[model samples]
Target chain A: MKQTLLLVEDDKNLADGLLVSLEQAGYECLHVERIADVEPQWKKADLVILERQLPDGDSVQHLPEWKKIKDVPVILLTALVTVKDKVAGLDSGANDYLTKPFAEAELFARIRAQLR
Target chain B: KQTLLLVEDDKNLADGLLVSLEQAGYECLHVERIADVEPQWKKADLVILERQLPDGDSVQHLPEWKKIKDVPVILLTALVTVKDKVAGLDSGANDYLTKPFAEAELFARIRAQLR
Candidate 1:
């Protein structure tokens, strides 16, 4: 049985692309565009790839509580690669960070690392 | 006591990282070049390395360093390409942080590697 992944990204193009690639890589994926949709699905997956901004709120803000309760790993894939933003994301409980426009293989590699 | 070795060619940048690292409760020593690092390298608990320097690319020496000490190395570099990142990790860097990195991120990465 394959593990499930919960991908929370607002960017439609990236989301569709990532989900397909992730599925091809042998993991089942749950795609959600909003933070509100995330809480309901995160517990169902083995790991989470979260985007910092959503239509409703900053997704990074809720990472601590989720991590506190389940201790699941979170990786942030966002355009916010600034020093201040990266520190904020990691401090907020993301196990890893991948800036937007990153290579697809790199994302796959990071996923494997977290799942490994 | 855990000790950290910071190897960066930029004098101003290295000094800033050293101060921040020390404040975070790590005893960090700065070595400005690759040629002058080994004397302190063998004694480090972890190493914060910059890929490019006046002498050479430090990643080339990472495999050798791993063989010698098995200590964790974090590459703090300006090399932002995906290929560069992959090469750094493949060369045995435990983590690869691009330039303009926050001191907090560096500290956090250090804690992870240390743990």
Candidate 2:
């Protein structure tokens, strides 16, 4: 199992909850919000836990730019559940998608799928 | 109209795809290059990405874009080898349509994958 993860989310409560859960699951978590902050750390991260929409911007918009650096697997976490929304997310280049309010098990499962 | 981005460099192939996909209910936006992909990516509901683009490979960016948006992209590849298919799917395409595929078959596969 990979020992670390870089989580990009703006919501404090959600980030806190995920940090605790992931820590308990034995992952060393590094969290961030802005895309600029993530750019420098991209190469070191084994897997990325990305929030679809952030206070600064939407994650989808930076995909091509991000790919110009690292090609690591990414899982999108969002509240958007429409079919079109899901398609938009996948089209943006995500490896997998897990809607918000998801259980830790589901998040873990998606990560496992991507990493495997 | 449901927007669909068709990235095929070959004009003849693009024309055929546009007509068929349009008949299948998609408002197709055909482009011949990877540089032309980003703008349509935001405006479309789904993407039909050709493995061979005039300017660049579209599969390389699949993972990063998928993280930001969960759009289903079906790759069009002439290489039908199993390894090639696995690589395309692993690169983040939801499904793939090999070349020489019939319009009906492609449409059915797209419907199944999208649903």
Tens digits of per-residue lDDT for model 1, B1-115? 8899999999999987788888778888788788887788889999999999999999898888888887878899999888888888777776788887777778776775675
The candidate that wins on TM-score is: 1
* Predicted structure 2: lDDT: 0.74
DockQ of each: 0.32, 0.04
lDDT of 2 by residue, A36-76 (tens): 68887777788889887788778878875776688777777
Task: Give the RMSD in angstroms, all C-alphas superposed, for model 1.
Answer: 3.4
Clashing pairs in 1: none
Give the clash total for candidate 1. 0
lDDT tens digits, residue span A1-116, model 1: 99888999888988888889899889999999997788788789898989887899888888888886676767899998776887788777877888887898777766765665
Docking class of 2: incorrect
lDDT of each residue in B24-114, candidate 2, tens digit only: 7788888788887776677767888888876767778778777767777878879765566667777777766678766654565465445
DockQ score, prediction 1: 0.32
Comparing only chain A of model 1 with the true chain A, what is the TM-score? 0.95
Model 1, runs deviating above 4 Å? A1-4, A112-116, B31-45, B53-56, B63-72, B100-115
